[PDB]
Structure 1
Amino acid sequence: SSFESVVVIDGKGHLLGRLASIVAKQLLSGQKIVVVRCEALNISGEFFRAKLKYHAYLRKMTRYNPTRGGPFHFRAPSRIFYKAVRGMIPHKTARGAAALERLKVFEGVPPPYDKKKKMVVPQALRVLRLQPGRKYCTVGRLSHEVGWKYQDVVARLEERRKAKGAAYYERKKLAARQLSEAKKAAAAKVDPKVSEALAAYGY
């Protein structure tokens, strides 16, 4: 447990409801949460069940005037996750509204979150939760099949971001290698008493 200024979560490989419950509990506890890559979230069960549930959601609409009061069906994966979170928070109170203002959801990793640390929640990871052999799906595929229009744009922006991250990774590998050679060189100049004291202390 650690209080942080803002927690950036990678939505890839995560289960929608478990991540939503954990994020909602953090929001009501008072922690700012930014979830990215909501198109890479996972729903347990194979794709036709999620498609059936979203079509059953689309079926529900107010009768006398569909421009007011009715369930507004959002086809974006980020706002699907936002609906999942909002169902878990008393959003009709001032406390729940203020908790929801501490949350930001995005598709892909827009800047400047591309140069920030993205953490994962092991209590909601699909690989650590689902039994092997069970079927699953992605929120992005369901969104694309129900009406999301920006699967390709987010995709191309993601290969651009991954290419820039690859260049950053070669730079980081070079920096780590030079740091290792610097430590090996400085091992012959640091005082042996200091080295022995640090090794005895655990460093």
Structure 2
Amino acid sequence: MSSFESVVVIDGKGHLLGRLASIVAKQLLSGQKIVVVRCEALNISGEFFRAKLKYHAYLRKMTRYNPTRGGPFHFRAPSRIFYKAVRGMIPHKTARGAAALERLKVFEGVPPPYDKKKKMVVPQALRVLRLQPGRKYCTVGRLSHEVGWKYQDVVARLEERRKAKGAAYYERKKLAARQLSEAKKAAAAKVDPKVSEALAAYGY
């Protein structure tokens, strides 16, 4: 509800490409630091061949004399595909626009300093809350792999190891919730019931 945070990290899984980009670009220009995680798990609406058509039309556009300078640099990674969408919504030719792009960070997968943090979600760009159930959708990761990304198996192996470490962490988190409920019930016998009567009325 219009909260101000130091750095907000967004899980890109199940998120529409342009609708997440317009939210992020508005946040970046307002002064909010944005880290986008799991860019390969982003979603594009329509069908897969339309996205494959659109990138091959993008892949058709190049400069004549030499593509090293002045040519459209076609990026095959999912993170840079998302970065291209955000940059088009930003006045990057100006100094205000470049400072906003410096506030953005995009990664394929969940890197080790950001798997320890709480990844938020944007309900205005989530696919299950926005797309009609019968309609088709594609995934940016399989778009990028079939156009030149060579690190899909690397990311999938690194995501598999993160789930195993996450699964063991959840068992410890499950045990800590056990011990907290056992302690709360036990401490409630000696908790001076004039205190607990007043806290119940106050909401707590």
Shared fold (TM-score, shorter chain, > 0.5): yes
Q: Deviations over 1:59-80 (max 9, x none)?
A: 0001121111111000000000
2:153 alignment partner, SS class: helix
Paired with 2:115 and 2:194, the residues of 1 have a C-alpha distance of: 44
The answer for unaligned runs of 5 or more in structure 2 is none
Displacement of 1:35 in angstroms is 0.3
Per-residue displacement from partner, 1:45-67 (whole Å, max 9, x unpaired)? 11000000000000000112111
> How big is the alpha-carbon RMSD for the aligned residues of Structure 1 and Structure 2?
0.4
What TM-score do you get using the length of structure 1 for normalisation? 0.99
Structure 2 distance, partners of 1:127, 1:159, is 24
Write the distance in 2 (CA, Å) between the matches of 1:24 and 1:171. 38
1:32 corresponding residue in structure 2: 33
Query: What secondary structure does 2:96 align onto?
Result: helix
CA distance in 2, matches of 1:177, 1:112: 28
- Cα deviation, 1:15-59, whole Å, max 9, x if unaligned, reads 000000000000000000000000000000110000000000000
Identity of aligned residues (%): 100
**What does residue 88 of structure 2 align with?**
87
Distance, in Å, in 2 between the alignment partners of 1:145 and 1:19 is 23
Q: TM-score, normalised by structure 2?
A: 0.99
Taking the aligned partners of 1:37 and 1:138, their CA distance within structure 2 comes to: 11
Tell me whether 60-69 or 15-24 shows the greater mean CA deviation.
Answer: 60-69
Cα offset, 1:194, TM superposition = 0.4
Deviation at 1:156, TM superposition (A): 0.3
Listed one character per residue, the Cα deviations across residues 74-131 of structure 1 (whole Å, up to 9, x for unaligned) are 0000000000000000000000000000000000000110100000000000000000
Q: Secondary structure at the match of 1:59?
A: coil
Residue 71 of structure 1 aligns to a residue in which SS? Answer: coil
What is the Cα deviation at residue 148 of structure 1?
Answer: 0.1
d(CA) in 1 for partners of 2:83, 2:190: 56
**Runs of 4+ with >2 A deviation:** none
Which runs of no fewer than 5 residues in structure 1 stay unpaired?
none
Question: Match for residue 58 of structure 2?
Answer: 57
**Aligned residues between the structures:** 203
